Amino acid sequence: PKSIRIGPGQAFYAX
Amino acid sequence: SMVACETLKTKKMEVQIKKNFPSVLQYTMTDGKVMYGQSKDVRTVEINGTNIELGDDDVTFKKVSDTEATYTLKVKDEAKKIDAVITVQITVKANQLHLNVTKIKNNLSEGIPEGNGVEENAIQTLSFPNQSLVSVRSSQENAQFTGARMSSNTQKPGDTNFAVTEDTNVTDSDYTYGFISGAGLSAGLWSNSEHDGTYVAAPVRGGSQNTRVYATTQQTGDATSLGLASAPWYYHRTVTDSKGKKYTVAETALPQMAVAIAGDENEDGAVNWQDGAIAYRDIMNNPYKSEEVPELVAWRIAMNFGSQAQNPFLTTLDNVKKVALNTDGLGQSVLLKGYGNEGHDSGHPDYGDIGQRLGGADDMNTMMEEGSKYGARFGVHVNASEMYPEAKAFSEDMVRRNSAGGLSYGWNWLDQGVGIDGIYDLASGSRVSRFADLSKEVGDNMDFIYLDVWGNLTSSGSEDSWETRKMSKMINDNGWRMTTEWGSGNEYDSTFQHWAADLTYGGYTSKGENSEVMRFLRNHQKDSWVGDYPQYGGAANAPLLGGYNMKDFEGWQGRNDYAAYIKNLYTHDVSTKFIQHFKVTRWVNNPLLTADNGNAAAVSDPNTNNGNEQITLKDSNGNVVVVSRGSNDTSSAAYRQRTITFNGVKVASGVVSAGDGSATGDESYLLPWMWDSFTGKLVKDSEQKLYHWNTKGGTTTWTLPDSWKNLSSVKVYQLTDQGKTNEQTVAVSGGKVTLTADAETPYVVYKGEAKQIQVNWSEGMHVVDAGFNGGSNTLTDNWTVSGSGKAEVEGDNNAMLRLTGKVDVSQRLTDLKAGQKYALYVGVDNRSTGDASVTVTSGGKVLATNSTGKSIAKNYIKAYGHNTNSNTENGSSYFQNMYVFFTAPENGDATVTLSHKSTDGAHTYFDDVRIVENQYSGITYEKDGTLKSLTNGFENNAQGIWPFVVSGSEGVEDNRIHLSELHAPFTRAGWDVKKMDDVLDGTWSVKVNGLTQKGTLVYQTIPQNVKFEAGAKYKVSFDYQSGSDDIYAIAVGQGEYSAGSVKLTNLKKALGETGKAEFELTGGVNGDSWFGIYSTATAPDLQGSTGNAQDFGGYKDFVLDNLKIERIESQTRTKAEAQDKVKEIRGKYDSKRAELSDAAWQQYQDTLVKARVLINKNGATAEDFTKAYDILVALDEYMKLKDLDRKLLEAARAGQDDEVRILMANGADVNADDNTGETPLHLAAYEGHLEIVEVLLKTGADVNAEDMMGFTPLHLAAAWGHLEIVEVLLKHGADVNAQDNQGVTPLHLAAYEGHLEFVEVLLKHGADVNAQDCFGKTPFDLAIDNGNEDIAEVLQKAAKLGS
Ligand SMILES: [Mn+2]
Ligand SMILES: [Mn+2]
Ligand SMILES: [Mn+2]
Ligand SMILES: [Mn+2]
């Protein structure tokens, strides 16, 4: 459900 | 003598007719019942829309006999330019009265001038307004009318049923069918009228709107009389083509109409339209060859497309034999889609051009002749609305033009389609001559024509019933049964509609004929109804009569699932076809008909089936079928329950599995199949059989038919793709049998022991069982297996030959023409590192041989049986054709061997051994047996784009790549808006249509087609045409295609002028080198073209011809030079281990080890040292470019603006990517280097490049706050609505961050505010969840703008 900052190899959603 | 009436008589009735007009006064049946005709003095004749009333002096009468009278009508109107003499014949037979116009004389014309020229004062239309041939009155007991109009909508019935009362008031109310009943009699009116009128629902024209009956009321004393008349007939119709040219065309037939008077025909104690409908079958037109429709159990499409020859005619014959075994010989109807020219949607409208790569007319005739012995009928897909420049029929007169004089463009796919001028094609005699070309090829062997798209207004704005009648006539005249695309189309002559039979297409508004009247009349004559597809509701919710449910397994829309095809046949089609062997006699309690939808007088019998729907059907031998619905309430589980009885015995019961594939049912049946699969005659009492199906599986008990009641046992066989298996003897007790069945498994029941259907696999194919359809036994009876390894027939769908270890599979070749040239090709998928081979021998000596190592190219041919969506092994398929070319030996002794060499555990798959006459002789070998040269002008390709194979630029598709064909001037640059030649040399070339901006491989050679020896040097050259600069590139690779591991060389524009490309290639160490054509990320230059001209111009196309591959001499090296080259390479790259990918270091080590093997081998020669040196030079060039790519990405991330400029100038790939798939543009946008972004975009970087997360540079720019980078990207064509792998768009990221400017620019360029990510969240939803209420309201205002 947590939204993180996008970047290389890092998707917007992690749950 | 002066008596104003006469009497015509039969044994069934007497009819009084008027002498002053072809009118009936009344019909009196033997039993004394009376039906009225035209009781009033009505003498109207309509010609060309003008009503003329006839006087006593305008009509002459002659009674020919007791059954016939003749009238001569003088029809004149000087002011309206009408001066005609109409001859009318009235005849009677049994309970029928016929009224025919036998002669039309025009006093104002000499006839139609030569070549269908305009006939001045032509009699175009004729009718008898309010003729009232039959009538009913409001004063008669149970006076009623039933009418039918066309409906393709499952929720909208086409019928009307009402009482005729004093208030009934109609004037030329038009219907496809009309029936009147009153005072114990019923009659329908038949006419051959081509009139188009009122319809309920139809998505197209094409004969959907044919209404032939006119109903009119008049006052007859104190009562209202409802009379039936024919709708107008066309005689000498004047028409206009797309260029304004006028023509007069003669009648399809002379005007005809009839009535048939019925009493209580079905003996149910009521007289209504159903009684009239039974008598009506004796007078109605019957579609040509409609008598064979109940035999057509197995319909399907066998597809060919884009020069590939996915389904050669002799392969289709084997598939017919597979279906025959699995259905125990039930009739089949195979639609050949792509039988002609290069395949489906190639060569339209050259009907006579039989696909040469499929085996031509000769194989098509063998397939049809041999197939008919299994009850298989064949037909071809034709198009009379769209054509391609390649078609020999393509001409300026054939071209449909618009009001402005421009081309009426069709669809662009392989080539640009052009609309056909339909009026010109008919009136000039062009279309009928192309059908005659086809008739010359097929003789009397072909069963039907399938006419695509007709009615969609592609050929003209009309395609009316008159054009459709003429179209169907020219088809039926050649002995061909008529079939068409649209559900509602061609009511008069079609026996099948693809959009009625394939229930998945178009939705609930565009299916088959939703009419109780039409289906009652013609269910047994057509596959044009509504079958079970419960998501459509209404007519599609478990129709009692079933209805054809068509599936396919031979490539149509990628369909290849053989087991699902057979399962579907037994689920819906066997019972549907069983029901079609009987004619409807009674139909009550229809839940679709209500007072609300205009059917208050529809029959509601509470004494039949508890007031629920029931249909009774009968054949000519007095057999009775009763079909009953469990409940008329759609909310009840019993709505879908159906019982079928045969002579009062239950033969089927339960719920069918939903036709839409959404719910398995419980239906079981034991259907007596009493008919042969030819003309449908009864089989000898001893050969009678029953088909058994049990949806859920289990045990059921049945009462056998009357002729089986005294048997003590029956023989039961399970049906498979091998035929009858697992024979069981089942006891009969008191005329009953108990059967145990597996779920959805077909069984056939005989009175005694039944013989196997005889099958000789691959007749005319020069080998027995070329497709491995003979089961395990084929490897013993047909093919010979030898070796320590294993050979097996594998795969439950399309069976293949599977090899493991050291094994040879061989068979002698038959029927070869001594001294003639042949290509032998076989589908091969090799998962082993060891070689898989095809060899042709003659007395132990090798005539030709070919091999493949591990297969490197996945199959992307949608219509092909072993494409990569079909799972040959491990979720993929690498099937590709492997060729040998040889001359049939004088001794007539030749053998094919399929083999696997290595002793490893990996598999090799083979399928479809094809031996074909072929003149290709462009391969030259070295003494070694290795390649000396390969030349190809593509003039003799057995199939496909050999030595190339289609790649994955469109995934599994009907690939927009094929062999283009010459037809000057239409295929050449300069015709209309065309700027490219389709063909460069001779008659054929390789054409790529519109595959720009794919950033991937379009097509490539593979080692089984052209093998490049490790270290050997080759000069490759070809002629080409390319629509724009750098849209296509030459790709050179090793092994399975990898983005980044290919050398690319951009090709410059060569538009309408042939360019030349040439390069050198050094064979890679693994012998897996190849070259091909790659689609770059570069946008084409459309040169200001708009609309269809963008596709027809050729700006996006690539044509290749005159391929030449030749082994060349390389500078000779000593062992010392090769050893020094090893030291130089090692000195350059050994220190770069940490800076390299694990796969990149292994490839480097692999190449070095292999180069050293060449150098250090005992007995190595100058050729080995030269190869070793050349491998190392190629390795150097490769490692060099990978380092420049790695440095371009590093300079982009760190922000070294000038370093980026020199690296790109030195050769670095602007579209290279790192570990996570970031291009230098992704890295420049992410870190915020506006200049680097601008420079990379100028160079030619993919603006919409995606990394591993699906992020485009815009996603990274918007999410990190780089405003100008966003604007620059958008200007260059960055997709504003690009969604990452979680459905997140730049607007979502912009809303989640918090700046209005991002939101505004994105929205201005077209950002979807209603974009939902994978969690269903919109950018607004992400804004409110982080405390960004400001942006949330701006987003809310933006969403409310388009509310
Ligand atoms: Mn009746
Ligand atoms: Mn096969
Ligand atoms: Mn050529
Ligand atoms: Mn073409």
- By residue count, chain A amounts to 15
The residue type found at B915 is I
Tokens 């169907």 correspond to what residue? B472
Assign 3-class secondary structure to B909-926: EEEEEEEEECCCCCEEEC
Query: What is the dihedral sign for C-alpha B364, B366, B369, B373?
Result: negative
Nearest chain A residue to B1254 by CA distance is: A11
CA–CA separation, B1283 and B1278 (whole Å): 12
**∠ CA(B1090), CA(B1094), CA(B1098), 5° rounding?**
150
Backbone angles phi, psi at B174, to 5 degrees: -100, 135
- Is there a contact between B812 and B902 (Cβ–Cβ < 8 Å)? no
Secondary structure percentages of chain B, helix, strand, coil, to 5: 20, 30, 45
Structural tokens at position B982: 């389709």
Grouping H, G, I as helix, E, B as strand and the rest as coil, residue B1259 is helix
The residue type found at B1156 is R
Using a CB-CB cut-off of 8 Å, the residues of chain A touching B1251 are 8
The residue type found at B726 is N
Structural tokens at position B129: 């307004």
Cis peptide before B969 (omega within 30 of 0): yes
Closest C-alpha to B1105, from B988, B966, B1018, B932: B988
CA–CA separation, B1261 and B1267 (whole Å): 7
The residue type found at B1279 is D
Structural tokens at position B131: 């003729």
**∠ CA(B987), CA(B989), CA(B990), 5° rounding?**
155
Structural tokens at position B643: 């019982």
User: CA distances (Å), B1248 to each of B257, B297, B1258, B1263, in order?
Assistant: 67, 50, 8, 16
Closest C-alpha to B478, from B435, B441, B426: B435
CA of B181 to the centre of ligand 1 (A): 10
Structural tokens at position B1235: 């200049």
User: CA distances (Å), B1259 to each of B518, B673, B1249, B1300, in order?
Assistant: 59, 65, 11, 16
For every residue of B1015-1071, DSSP letters joined together read T-EEEEEEEEEESSTTSEEEEEEESS--TTSSEEEEPPPEEEEEEEEEEEEE--TTS
Q: Tell if the CB–CB gap between A12 and B1286 is shorter than 8 Å.
A: yes
Beta-strand ranges (E) seen in B1232-1294 are none
CA–CA separation, B822 and B813 (whole Å): 12
Strand pairing class (B448-452; B376-383): parallel
Backbone angles phi, psi at B457, to 5 degrees: 70, 25
Nearest chain B residue to A5 by CA distance is: B1263
CA–CA separation, B1113 and B1016 (whole Å): 9
User: CA distances (Å), B214 to each of B46, B172, B251, B798, B832, in order?
Assistant: 14, 5, 21, 55, 74
Grouping H, G, I as helix, E, B as strand and the rest as coil, residue B237 is strand
CA–CA separation, B935 and B932 (whole Å): 10
Tokens 């097929």 correspond to what residue? B442
Experimental structure resolution, Å: 2.0
| Residue-wise burial string across A1-15, b where 16 or more C-beta atoms lie within 10 A, e elsewhere | eebeebbbeebbbee
For every residue of B837-854, DSSP letters joined together read EEEEEETTEEEEEEEESS
CA–CA separation, B412 and B1096 (whole Å): 8
Q: Tell if the CB–CB gap between B1285 and A6 is shorter than 8 Å.
A: no
User: CA distances (Å), B360 to each of B34, B355, B435, B728, B933, in order?
Assistant: 62, 5, 17, 45, 30
CB contact residues (below 8 A), chain A span 1-15, against chain B = 3, 5-13
CA–CA separation, B250 and B117 (whole Å): 11
Query: What is the dihedral sign for C-alpha B522, B523, B529, B535?
Result: positive
DSSP-assigned beta bridge partners for residue B957: B861
Tell me the shortest Cα–Cα distance from B1319 to chain A, in angstroms.
9
Q: Tell if the CB–CB gap between A11 and B1230 is shorter than 8 Å.
A: no
Structural tokens at position B1105: 């011809």
Task: State the Cα torsion B968-B972-B973-B976 to the nearest 10°.
Answer: 60
User: CA distances (Å), B456 to each of B497, B527, B767, in order?
Assistant: 14, 20, 45
The residue type found at B824 is L
- Give the HSE-up count for residue B569: Cα atoms under 13 Å, Cβ half-sphere: 29
Tell me the shortest Cα–Cα distance from A2 to chain B, in angstroms.
11
Q: Which residues contact B1132 (CB under 8 A, 6 or more apart)?
A: B1180, B1183
- Give the HSE-up count for residue B1073: Cα atoms under 13 Å, Cβ half-sphere: 20
The residue type found at B875 is G
The residue type found at B327 is T
Assign 3-class secondary structure to B176-220: CEEEEEECCEEEEEEECCCCECCCCECCCCCCCCECCEEEEEEEE
- Is there a contact between B378 and B336 (Cβ–Cβ < 8 Å)? yes
Closest C-alpha to B1314, from B1287, B1334, B1296, B1333: B1287
User: CA distances (Å), B1116 to each of B1064, B1120, B1170, in order?
Assistant: 17, 12, 5
DSSP-assigned beta bridge partners for residue B839: B849, B897
Number of neighbouring beta carbons within 10 Å of residue B324:
23
CA–CA separation, B843 and B1309 (whole Å): 73
- Is there a contact between B314 and B763 (Cβ–Cβ < 8 Å)? yes
The residue type found at B528 is S
Using a CB-CB cut-off of 8 Å, the residues of chain B touching A12 are 1284, 1286, 1288, 1292-1293, 1317
- Longest CA pairwise span in chain B (Å): 127
Grouping H, G, I as helix, E, B as strand and the rest as coil, residue B1335 is helix
**What residues have their beta carbon closer than 5 A to ion ligand 4?**
B 390, 414-415, 964
Q: Which residues contact B133 (CB under 8 A, 6 or more apart)?
A: B24, B37, B38, B97, B99, B189, B227, B228, B229, B230, B257, B259
- Is there a contact between B808 and B790 (Cβ–Cβ < 8 Å)? no
Strand pairing class (B298-303; B332-337): parallel
CA–CA separation, B6 and B757 (whole Å): 63
Using a CB-CB cut-off of 8 Å, the residues of chain A touching B1220 are 8-9
Strand pairing class (B213-220; B481-484): unpaired
Backbone angles phi, psi at B1096, to 5 degrees: -70, -30
Of the listed ligands, the closest to the CA of B983 is 3
What is the 8-class DSSP label of residue B1327?
Answer: H
Give the H/E segment covering residue B245: none
Closest C-alpha to B1190, from B1149, B1223, B1142, B1231: B1223
Structural tokens at position B640: 């879908």
Structural tokens at position B111: 């006839």
- By residue count, chain B amounts to 1347
- Is there a contact between B895 and B840 (Cβ–Cβ < 8 Å)? yes
Structural tokens at position B1005: 């050679």
Grouping H, G, I as helix, E, B as strand and the rest as coil, residue B75 is strand
Nearest chain B residue to A8 by CA distance is: B1220
User: CA distances (Å), B1330 to each of B383, B1200, B1286, B1324, B1336, in order?
Assistant: 59, 36, 19, 11, 10
Chains A, B: CB pairs < 8 Å: 42
The residue type found at B321 is K
Give the H/E segment covering residue B1275: helix B1267-1275
CA–CA separation, B673 and B690 (whole Å): 6
Structural tokens at position B1068: 């890679």
Q: Which residues contact B1163 (CB under 8 A, 6 or more apart)?
A: none
Backbone angles phi, psi at B1109, to 5 degrees: -120, 120
Backbone angles phi, psi at B1151, to 5 degrees: -65, -45
Helices (H), B283-312: none
CA–CA separation, B377 and B442 (whole Å): 13
- Is there a contact between B803 and B838 (Cβ–Cβ < 8 Å)? no
CA–CA separation, B934 and B980 (whole Å): 27
CA–CA separation, B1340 and B1342 (whole Å): 5
Closest C-alpha to B783, from B764, B765, B768, B799: B768
**What residues have their beta carbon closer than 5 A to ion ligand 1?**
B 264, 266, 268, 270, 275
Grouping H, G, I as helix, E, B as strand and the rest as coil, residue B243 is coil
Secondary structure percentages of chain A, helix, strand, coil, to 5: 0, 40, 60
CA of B943 to the centre of ligand 4 (A): 14
Q: Which residues contact B195 (CB under 8 A, 6 or more apart)?
A: B174, B210, B211, B212, B231, B232, B233, B465
CA–CA separation, B1099 and B1097 (whole Å): 6
User: CA distances (Å), B310 to each of B255, B560, B992, in order?
Assistant: 47, 12, 19
CA–CA separation, B862 and B587 (whole Å): 45
Structural tokens at position B293: 């429709």
Closest C-alpha to B104, from B119, B124, B120: B124
Closest C-alpha to B454, from B439, B428, B475, B436: B475
CA of B964 to the centre of ligand 4 (A): 4
Q: Tell if the CB–CB gap between A11 and B1220 is shorter than 8 Å.
A: no
Q: Which residues contact B1325 (CB under 8 A, 6 or more apart)?
A: none
What is the 8-class DSSP label of residue B1238?
Answer: H
- Is there a contact between B210 and B195 (Cβ–Cβ < 8 Å)? yes
Q: Which residues contact B599 (CB under 8 A, 6 or more apart)?
A: B157, B159, B160, B161, B162, B593
Query: Which CATH number applies to B5-281: 2.70.98.10, 3.40.50.300, 2.40.37.10, 2.40.30.170?
Result: 2.70.98.10
CA–CA separation, B438 and B68 (whole Å): 42
DSSP-assigned beta bridge partners for residue B668: B653, B694
Using a CB-CB cut-off of 8 Å, the residues of chain A touching B1286 are 11-13
CA–CA separation, B1159 and B1341 (whole Å): 75
Q: Which residues contact B112 (CB under 8 A, 6 or more apart)?
A: B119, B122, B236, B248, B249, B250
- Is there a contact between B331 and B375 (Cβ–Cβ < 8 Å)? yes
Number of neighbouring beta carbons within 10 Å of residue B405:
8
Burial of B776 (0-12, 13-18, 19+ CB in 10 A): exposed
User: CA distances (Å), B969 to each of B388, B447, B773, B976, B983, in order?
Assistant: 12, 36, 46, 10, 11
Structural tokens at position B1320: 């269903």
